[PDB]
Design a protein around this nucleic acid. Structure first.
Length: 248
DNA sequence: CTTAT
DNA sequence: GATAAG
């Protein structure tokens, strides 16, 4: 199967990703910014117990680490932990938004390429390391009143809710896939952050290109969802469109 | 929870 | 003077 042939490329079998060719990211602040420390609003026990196994897994994976930081933003329960990074986002220097909008992205899909593979990268932002100098920016408080730990944690990887994560990830993956594009000039590769479309002229070419793309992604440290993958189809769902008969 | 619309 | 999103 596709599963057995590419164990490193699939999130199901390859472990959590880590983009090994990408330098840890430094996040420049606006020229006047100073740290902001917002106290954690009390959380119900139900919410804390709901969030707790997620925090523990991320600690076990090294994606969260303890820290002491003059920055602090609140964690809210939604259970899944969601950090309110709005006050951090306000203090981080803006970057040019380079992620294309889906409409324009799909304009570069010619009618000659009607065999599609769609891949969805799992935990994409977490594949990109943060430089240690930038980690304290994203700190939050974590209380386990049972275990007694009160203290801060922060992220060692590009975090959810940070305003520049989609653009930084898209630019990083473009750098990492630049050689693949050169090695496969007859394939069409559309990147929308963690959502990838590979298009070829034939089933065979789509199979060989998909093999090459999975091998490349896994080698670089990214991980695709084997469950969601649409491999070598003439109809796929991509970015909310149904791609069928060259339409949409 | 807070906060921008 | 309910709403979606971090």
């Amino acid at each position: 199967t596709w599963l057995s042939d590419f164990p490193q490329a699939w999130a199901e079998t390859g472990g959590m990703g880590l983009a090994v060719r990408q330098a840890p990211l430094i996040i420049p602040l606006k020229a006047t910014s100073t740290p902001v420390s917002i106290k954690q609003y009390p959380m119900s026990q139900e919410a804390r117990l709901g969030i707790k196994p997620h925090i523990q897994r991320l600690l076990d994976q090294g994606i969260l680490v303890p820290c002491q930081s003059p920055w602090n933003t609140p964690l809210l329960p939604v259970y899944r932990p969601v950090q309110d990074l709005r006050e951090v986002n306000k203090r981080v220097e803006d970057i040019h938004p380079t992620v294309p909008n889906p409409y324009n992205l799909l304009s570069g899909l010619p009618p000659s390429h009607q065999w599609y593979t769609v891949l969805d990268l799992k935990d994409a932002f977490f594949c990109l390391r943060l430089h240690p100098t930038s980690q304290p920016l994203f700190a939050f408080e974590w209380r386990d009143p049972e275990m007694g730990i009160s203290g801060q944690l922060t992220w060692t990887r590009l975090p959810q809710g940070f305003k520049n994560s989609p653009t930084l990830f898209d630019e990083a993956l473009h750098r990492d896939l630049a050689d693949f594009r050169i090695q496969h000039p007859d394939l069409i590769l559309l990147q929308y952050v963690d959502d990838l479309l590979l298009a070829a002229t034939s089933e065979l070419d789509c199979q060989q290109g998909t093999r090459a793309l999975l091998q490349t992604l896994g080698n670089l440290g990214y991980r695709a969802s084997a469950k969601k993958a649409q491999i070598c189809q003439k109809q796929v769902k991509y970015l909310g469109y149904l791609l069928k008969e060259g339409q949409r």
